[PDB]
C-alpha cells in the first residue's frame, strides 16, 4: 500500500502544474511581451489544474486516506523567454501529470480497489 | 503560406478530441461500468476542447483567414473497455493536440506573423 | 425494437445540426460578411443543440441502452452565401430534427415504454 | 415600409410562442401526467423564446423603430392531452416563427436595409 | 373552494405585470427618451415578475391544482410619456399584485390549508 | 437643493427595507413556523433591495454628490407572528419605498436635472 | 447558556462590518478620491461579510435558537480621509470579527455543543 | 525603490495563506473530524486569497513591474488538531497578510506613486 505516497505526489504535482501555468500566464501579461491570447490560455489551465488538484483532495477524504502537503516548488523560471519554449514545457508537463495519473492507476489495478480506480 | 491547412487541421483535431472525450465520458456513464468520477472528468475535457476549438475559429476570422471544416471522425471505438486504456488514449491524444499546436507555432516563427504567434 | 437505431440517429442528427449551426455562425463572423447579430444567433443554437444532444445521451444510459456514434458529417458548405439561404437551411434542418424526434416518439407509443416516452 | 407591422407581429409571435411553451411545460408538470423530461424541455424553450423576443425588441430601438405590443393570446388549450400532439404543435409553431423570420427577411432584401438584414 | 379562481387570477396578474414592466423598460430604451437607468430597472422587474409568476405555477402543481391561463392583456399604453407617470403606474400596479397576494392569503386562512398558506 | 437629504433618506430607506426583509425571511425559517416558500421570497427581496440600495449609491457618486449613511434601524419586531401580518407590513413598506422614489422624482422635475431624473 | 447573546452580537458585528466596508468602498468611489482598486476590494468584503452574516443566521435556526437583531450602527465616519487610515480600521475591525468568532468558540468548548462547535 | 521586494513578498504571502487555508479546509473534511461548516469556510477563504493574490499580480504588470515567485511553503502542519487552534492561526495569519498590505502602503506614501497607492 505504497499508493498513499502516489496520492500526495499527484496532489502536489497538479498543485505545482497550476503554479507553473500561472507564472507562464502572467509572463505573457507583462507589457513587454504582451501576447494576450497566451496569457489567457495559461491562466485558465492554472485554474483548471488548481481545481482538479482539489477534486483529488476531496476524493481522498472520501476514501478515508490521509493528505500530506509538500511545498509547491518554484516554477523553473520567471521568464520562459518565448511562447514556443513554454509550449514545449507545458507539453511535457501536461504529459507528466497525465502519465503519473496513469502510473497511480495501474497500481490500483494490481490491487483491486473499487474507490482508487477513480481519480 | 501552407499554414491555413494547419489551422483547419488544428480546428478539426480539437473538434475530434472533444468527440472522443464525449464517448469516453458516456462509456463510463453506462450502468454496466459506472465510474462516475471518470465520466465527469471526460465530459469536462469534452467541453473544454469544444470551447478551445471555437476560440481558434474566432481567432481565425480576426486574422481574415478562411475556415474549412472536415468531418469529425468517429471515435476509434464506442467501448474503451477500461479506464486505463482510455487514459493511455487520452494521454497520447492530448499530446497530439498540443504537439500540433506547437507544430503550427514553429511555422509562424519562421515567418514572423504577429497574429499567428497566438493561439 | 428497431428504436435503438433511431436513438443513435437522433443523437448524430442533433450533433450534426450544431455542427451546421457552428459553421453558419462563423461564416457571418468573417470580416467580409460581418453580420454580428446572425453569428450570435447561430452560435447559440450550436451550443443549444450540442447540449440537447448530450441530454439524450444521458437519458440513454438511464435506460440501459447502448450509444453508437457515427461521424458528424461535414456541413453541406462552408459559405451559405447569404443570411436568407442559411435561414431556409436552418428552417428545414430544425424541422428535420423535430420531426425525427416526433418520428421516434410514435415508435414508443405503439410499444408502451414508460422511459422512451420522454426525450 | 410595411415592415414595421412585421416587426411587432414577429415580436408578438415569439412572445406568444413562449406562452404556449410555458403551458405545455407545466402541463407535463401536473402530478397526473408527470413527464419531467418534457416539462423541462418546454420550460427551456419558453425561456429561450422569451429571451429571443426581447432581443428583437432591443434591435428595434437600435433602429429607431417603434414597438407596438398586442395581447399575448391564450394558448390554444390548457391540456395538450399527449406528449405527441404537443410535439406536432410545437413543430408547426417552431416552423411558423422561423418562416415568419424568413418572411420578414426577404422584405428587407428587396429594400436594402443594412440594419434590418439582421434579426 | 373559490380559491382556484384566485390562483389563475394571481398567475395572470403577475404575467401581466411583467408585460407592463417590459414595455415600460423598452419605452425608456427608445433613442428619443433614452433614460438607461430606468430601462434597466423596469427590465429587471419584468424578469423578476415573470420568474415569480412561474414560481406560483410550480407551487400549483405541487398542490394538485389546475392551471388555467388567460390572455396577457395589452399594456395600457406603448408610451408612458414620462418616467414619473410610469412610476405612479408601477406603484399602483405593484400594490395591486401584492394586495391580491394578500387577498388570496386571507382566503386560505379562513380555511386552513397547509399548502396554500405559502405563495 | 434639499434633494441631497432625499438621496441619503432613500439610500437608508432601501437599506432598512432589506433589513426588515431579512428578519422576515429568517422568522419563517425557524423550525417552529417553517414556511420555506415565504422565507425564500423574503430572503430574495432582502437581496433585491440591498442591491438596489447600492445601485443608488453608485449613481450618487456618478453625480458628484455626497453619501451620508445613518443607522439601519432595528426591524419593528423579530417575530411577525404571521405570514399575513408580515405581508401587510411589506405591502405598506414596499409602497413607502416606491412612493419616496416618486417623491424624490417630482423634486427633480421642478428643477430640471438630467442626471437626477434617473434612479 | 449566555452564548445566545454572543450569537446575536456576532450576527450584528458582521452586519456592521459589511456596513463599514460599504461606506469605505463608495468613499474611494467619489470622483474626488477615485481609487478604483480600493472601492472594488471594500465592496467585495462588504458582500463577503453580508453573506457570512446570513450564513450564521441560517446556522442559528438549524440549532433551534432565537435571532434578535439590533441596529446596524452608523459607520464611524463617512470619509476615511485616506486609504491607509481605512486599512488600519479594517485591519482592526477584521481582527474584532475574527477574535469574537474565536471568543464564542471557546464558550462552546467549555460546554460541549456539537452544533455550536461550527460557525 | 525596495518596494518590488515587498510586492513579490505580498504575492507569495497571499499565495501561502490560501495554501494554509486549503489544508485547514480539508483537515475538517476528513471523516474523522467532520466539521462541514468549517471545511466550507476555509475552502472559500482559500479561493478568496488565491484570487486576491492573482489580482495583485495583474496590478503589477499594469505597473510595468517584475513578478518573481518563490516557493509556496508547506503549511506549518497537516493537522490543526482543533477548530479553535486553527482559528487562532488564521486570525494571526489574516492579520499578517493585512498588516503587510498596510506595510507596503506606507512605503508608497513616503514616495508618492499614483499606481502603488492601490492594491
Swiss-Prot record, chains A, B, C, D, E, F, G, H:
GO BP annotations, alphabetical order: immune response; intracellular iron ion homeostasis; iron ion transport; negative regulation of cell population proliferation; negative regulation of ferroptosis; negative regulation of fibroblast proliferation
Listed GO CC annotations: autolysosome; autophagosome; cytoplasm; cytosol; extracellular exosome; extracellular region; ferritin complex; ficolin-1-rich granule lumen
EC number from the UniProt entry: 1.16.3.1
Binding site for Fe cation 1: 14, 49, 52
Tissue specificity statement from the Swiss-Prot or TrEMBL entry: Expressed in the liver.
Outcome of mutating residue 9 to A: Abrogates interaction with NCOA4. Fails to localize to punctate lysosomal structures
Domain Ferritin-like diiron: 1-119
Binding residues for Fe cation 2: 49, 94
Disulfide bonds: none
One MF annotation (Gene Ontology) recorded for this entry: ferroxidase activity
Keyword Cytoplasm included in the entry's annotation: yes
Subcellular compartments: Cytoplasm; Lysosome; Cytoplasmic vesicle, Autophagosome
Main location (coarse class): cytoplasm
Catalytic activity: 4 Fe(2+) + O2 + 4 H(+) = 4 Fe(3+) + 2 H2O
Keywords for the protein's UniProt record, in alphabetical order: Acetylation, Cytoplasm, Cytoplasmic vesicle, Iron, Iron storage, Lysosome, Metal-binding, Neurodegeneration, Oxidoreductase, Phosphoprotein
Top-rank lineage group of the source organism: Eukaryota
Family recorded in the similarity comment: Belongs to the ferritin family.
Associated clinical condition: Hemochromatosis 5: A disorder of iron metabolism characterized by iron overload. Excess iron is deposited in a variety of organs leading to their failure, and resulting in serious illnesses including cirrhosis, hepatomas, diabetes, cardiomyopathy, arthritis, and hypogonadotropic hypogonadism. Severe effects of the disease usually do not appear until after decades of progressive iron loading. Neurodegeneration with brain iron accumulation 9: An autosomal dominant neurodegenerative disorder associated with iron accumulation, primarily in the basal ganglia. It is characterized by global developmental delay apparent from infancy, and progressive decline of motor and cognitive skills. Clinical features include delayed walking or inability to walk, spasticity with hyperreflexia, ataxia, dystonia, and poor or absent language.
Function: Stores iron in a soluble, non-toxic, readily available form. Important for iron homeostasis. Has ferroxidase activity. Iron is taken up in the ferrous form and deposited as ferric hydroxides after oxidation. Also plays a role in delivery of iron to cells. Mediates iron uptake in capsule cells of the developing kidney. Delivery to lysosomes is mediated by the cargo receptor NCOA4 for autophagic degradation and release of iron.
Subunit structure: Oligomer of 24 subunits. There are two types of subunits: L (light) chain and H (heavy) chain. The major chain can be light or heavy, depending on the species and tissue type. In the human liver, the heavy chain is predominant. The functional molecule forms a roughly spherical shell with a diameter of 12 nm and contains a central cavity into which the insoluble mineral iron core is deposited. Interacts with NCOA4; NCOA4 promotes targeting of the iron-binding ferritin complex to autolysosomes following starvation or iron depletion.
Protein name per UniProt: Ferritin heavy chain
Organism: Homo sapiens
Portion of the full-length sequence here: 15 to 133 of 183
Amino acid at each position: 500500500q505504497d499508493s498513499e505516497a502516489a496520492i500526495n505526489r499527484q496532489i502536489n504535482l497538479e498543485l505545482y502544474a497550476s503554479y507553473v501555468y500561472l507564472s507562464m500566464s502572467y509572463y505573457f501579461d507583462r507589457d513587454d511581451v504582451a501576447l494576450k491570447n497566451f496569457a489567457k490560455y495559461f491562466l485558465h489551465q492554472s485554474h483548471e489544474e488548481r481545481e482538479h488538484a482539489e477534486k483529488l483532495m476531496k476524493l481522498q477524504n472520501q476514501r478515508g486516506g490521509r493528505i500530506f502537503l509538500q511545498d509547491i516548488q518554484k516554477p523553473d523560471c520567471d521568464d520562459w523567454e518565448s511562447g514556443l519554449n513554454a509550449m514545449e514545457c507545458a507539453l511535457h508537463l501536461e504529459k507528466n501529470v497525465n502519465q503519473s495519473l496513469l502510473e497511480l492507476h495501474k497500481l490500483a489495478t494490481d490491487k483491486n480497489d473499487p474507490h482508487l480506480c477513480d481519480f
